[PDB]
């Protein structure tokens, strides 16, 4: 078998560190002047082809952010590996939530967790898994032993298929109804139509430009409809969720 993997996360999350740990020395060529970094390894007969997305804080349409946002929607991947810095979860997991809305196979890799044990803060990864609805693993991206064990675990997961349960993240009645009017427009695409509709409601360039004139005017009309500023409602919903989540999964 061949498996294709994307590594994604915030700058200095350690996604580059994990990328490097898993690949050793391997290739580099462009996405445009922006450089595209690719590497491989072999484990248990199977080959692994990895692409590293530039570091981003959010999937917004800013050229590095553009590339990454494009790539999580359209680039082939058997799995997305979201590397997360554990020492600032409220910020890090924002993108995680966006990634979960896509409903593409993914894993969340919690980095920097020995830094967190300093503070005498522990995380319940069982519950965090229950919240996110994807695999969550603890892994220091900078020790090669744990990265190597991670190779076997990744191989396992890819082999049996990654079980995911859809993230229960609700935007309130008015926004849900707007999402609902628009999903058909985005049905039977390579990604969840709900995420595409959310992207469109956010006036995402990437999604919106794929549309014909009529349906563009339908999206823009739904934007106009919404009483609350959208970018702000999406943030309150999301950061409220991470506060909920963080208050369940943390203990000092
Ligand atoms: Cl899902």
Author numbering: 1 to 31, 35 to 64, 70 to 260
What does the paper say about this structure?
To overcome this issue, VcNFeoB was recloned into a vector encoding for N-terminal (His)6 tag fused to a cleavable SUMO moiety. Expression and purification followed the same procedures as previously described (vide supra), and the SUMO tag was cleaved prior to crystallization. Crystals of the SUMO-cleaved apo domain were generated and ultimately diffracted to 2.3 Å resolution in the P121 space group consistent with 2 molecules in the asymmetric unit (ASU). Using the 3.7 Å resolution model, we were able to solve the 2.3 Å resolution structure of the tagless protein (Rw/Rf = 0.203/0.266). The X-ray crystal structure of the apo VcNFeoB NTPase domain reveals the presence of a typical NFeoB fold. Distinctly present are the two common NFeoB subdomains: the globular G-protein subdomain that is responsible for binding and hydrolyzing nucleotides (blue) and the hammer-shaped guanine-dissociation inhibitor (GDI) subdomain that regulates nucleotide dissociation and connects directly to the FeoB transmembrane region (red). Within the G-protein domain, two switch regions (known as Switch I and Switch II) that regulate nucleotide hydrolysis and communicate nucleotide status to the GDI domain are present, albeit Switch I is mostly disordered, while Switch II is mostly ordered in the apo form. Surprisingly, a comparison of the VcNFeoB NTPase domain to other structurally characterized NFeoB domains displays strong structural conservation in both subdomains (Cα RMSD <1 Å on average) even though the NFeoB is not a strict GTPase. These observations indicate that gross structural changes in the NFeoB region do not account for the observed nucleotide promiscuity of V. cholerae FeoB per se.
For this bacterium, Feo is the primary system that transports Fe2+ into the cytosol. FeoA and FeoC are known to be small (ca. 7–10 kDa) cytosolic proteins, while FeoB is a large (ca. 80–100 kDa) polytopic transmembrane protein that contains an N-terminal soluble G-protein-like domain termed NFeoB. The status of GTP and GDP bound to the NFeoB region is hypothesized to control the opening and closing of the FeoB pore and therefore the translocation of Fe2+ into the bacterial cytosol.
